[PDB]
Design an enzyme around this catalytic site. Structure first.
Site, short mmCIF file in Angstrom:
data_model
loop_
_atom_site.label_atom_id
_atom_site.label_comp_id
_atom_site.label_asym_id
_atom_site.label_seq_id
_atom_site.Cartn_x
_atom_site.Cartn_y
_atom_site.Cartn_z
N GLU B 33 0.73 -1.18 0.12
CA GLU B 33 -0.03 -0.17 0.00
C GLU B 33 0.92 1.35 -0.01
O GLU B 33 0.63 2.27 -0.82
CB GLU B 33 -0.92 0.02 1.27
CG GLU B 33 -1.56 -1.34 1.55
CD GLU B 33 -2.13 -1.42 2.95
OE1 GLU B 33 -2.83 -0.36 3.21
OE2 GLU B 33 -2.45 -2.48 3.54
N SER B 34 1.59 1.30 0.82
CA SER B 34 2.63 2.42 1.01
C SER B 34 4.20 1.96 0.87
O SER B 34 4.75 1.42 1.79
CB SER B 34 2.45 3.42 2.22
OG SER B 34 2.31 2.32 3.47
#
Lengths: 235, 151, 156, 79
Positions: B33-34
């Site tokens: 996600e990040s």
């Protein structure tokens, strides 16, 4: 008499119809119902062409090609009565016939494929394509190269060609938003060289330009001006 | 596209966050996600209770603890419940995941599981790792190992 | 009886199965197990079509096409029982059959080819393509013009 | 499967038409916010060349204030 339990396109894919066919041929050869081994061969080669050109046939064939039958004295497996090459052709035909015997399957799969090549996100087309490759394994259970497994291959190697362009259009969108951050960074550096006691102009028409920034517009100072005040207010 | 060799603040923090699940998974859930927990949904920040690595990895570790604890043996089910909550959208999927009906989970849950089962362990691992092969004996290629070098 | 050591798609590419086939045909012709030279020919032409339409067959064929067999009084090599042209067709078929008998190989190679035509740097696509040309020489060991060697040519 | 390929382009041409008419509403919203920060007692310019710009608005033309100016008067007349 074979069309009693080998025609209902749901009664083929059952795992007993293989046993029914094996027992039919065996008890016909033994109990005289099928007299001649030159005639049990015709029954084999006609029941396989009935079951191959019919929805539900690929798995019946793949199940029967492992049962034992004894013809001409030599005992063998139905994948070996018919040659290896001829059995490959047979299973290819038995898999791809249920897509040109009914056009509902052909319509449905082609439309899901094409509406999977037209999704905006190329990463969300790939799970659609794995979905299609998952609903092909329910109608074609042998690993030959049927033409539908060519639809899926062209679809995957078309989605790759789509991502080669979508990624180019995302890198051209992180090029025009890293420019608009380079410009604020250089404007801040100019203000800071002017504050700390150095004689360099701070008009937007006198910043430096190095192809990471482009030419400075007026609105790239307004943006900066409302963003130092916004940051100083938050301390 | 990823490896476990390069170490940074991420591997420095999840060493204790996993002690307060699995360090291998928690390093991988955040990465996807990040890049190097990205609770982007505003409601996920109001429910999970920001951009501080002292609690962000601590928030994911707490949720993934219960998610990997609500069954205690289904870690792929845990990663699925993470990005697909159990309200009005994940319930139809999570009840369709255990029955092996992966063709009816989601276009995003499958792509998420298929990226993290290489470091996660579930009984349905080898059953999804072959969910969509070109032939029923084949292995369906996930999104970011068929779209590898394209960039 | 040949499907005992000529079907397991890993037992073909071994370098003894060639000797097994040569000894089978020879000792069948000598010790009466294969009576007629009009029947050893059918055994040849059926075992080669079993081994050509099967993964692992191209190298078994290329290995057996150099062993000696004696039919109709005239002794020869299996590349010469079957004509030169017919042996070329045979090896082409034996190489390209393991790409339409299993669709996993076809999928895999086509996707590596296409994801090698979509690399940004054209110089870093060429080493990917030499990689593909290196993993084709492990499944097609004869120099005929199989259709996969046409994928690689169009890719380059 | 040709009409699907046609809709993939027609939808792109409709999203590019709701991009140039949501810009021209973003600009009126930001101009109103500027007038309102100036009225309620705060020192920020209200010239069209001094609004903020964030890729949802683009560069401000002069006619994006005329439009706004005839639209507050139109709204104040209707109260």
């Amino acid at each position: 008499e074979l069309n009693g339990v080998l025609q209902d396109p749901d009664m083929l894919r059952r795992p007993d119809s293989a046993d029914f066919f094996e027992k039919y041929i065996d008890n016909g050869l033994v109990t005289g119902a099928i007299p001649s081994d030159a005639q049990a061969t015709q029954l084999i080669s006609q029941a396989f062409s009935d079951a191959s050109s019919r929805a539900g046939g690929a798995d019946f064939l793949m199940r029967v090609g492992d049962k034992k039958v004894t013809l001409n004295g030599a005992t063998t497996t139905y994948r070996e009565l018919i040659g290896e090459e001829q059995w490959n052709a047979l299973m290819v035909t038995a898999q791809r016939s249920q897509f040109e015997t009914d056009a509902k399957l052909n319509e449905q799969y082609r439309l899901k494929i094409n509406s999977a090549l037209n999704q905006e996100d190329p990463r969300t087309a790939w799970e659609m394509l794995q979905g299609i490759k998952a609903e092909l394994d329910k109608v074609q259970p042998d690993e030959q190269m049927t033409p539908q497994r060519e639809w899926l291959i062209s679809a995957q190697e078309q989605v790759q060609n789509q991502m080669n362009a979508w990624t180019k259009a995302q890198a051209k969108a992180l090029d025009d938003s890293m420019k608009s951050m380079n410009k604020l960074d250089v404007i801040d550096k100019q203000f800071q060289k002017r504050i700390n006691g150095e004689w360099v102009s701070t008009d937007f028409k006198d910043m430096p330009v190095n192809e990471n920034t482009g030419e400075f517009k007026h609105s790239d100072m307004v943006n900066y001006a409302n963003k130092k005040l916004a940051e100083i207010d938050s301390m | 596209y990823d490896k476990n060799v390069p170490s940074d603040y991420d591997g420095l923090f999840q060493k204790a966050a996993d002690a307060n699940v699995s360090y291998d998974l928690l390093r991988k859930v955040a990465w996807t996600e990040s890049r190097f927990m990205q609770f982007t949904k505003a409601t996920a920040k109001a429910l999970g209770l920001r951009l501080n690595p002292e609690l962000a990895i601590n928030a994911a570790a707490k949720q993934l603890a219960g998610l990997v604890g609500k069954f205690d043996g289904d870690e792929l089910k845990a990663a699925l419940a993470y990005n697909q909550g159990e309200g009005r959208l994940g319930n139809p999927q999570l009840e369709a995941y255990s029955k092996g009906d992966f063709a009816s989970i989601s276009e995003e849950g499958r792509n998420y599981m298929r990226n993290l089962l290489d470091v996660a362990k579930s009984p349905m691992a080898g059953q999804l790792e072959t969910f969509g092969g070109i032939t029923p004996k084949g292995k369906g290629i996930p999104a970011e190992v068929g779209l590898a070098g394209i960039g």
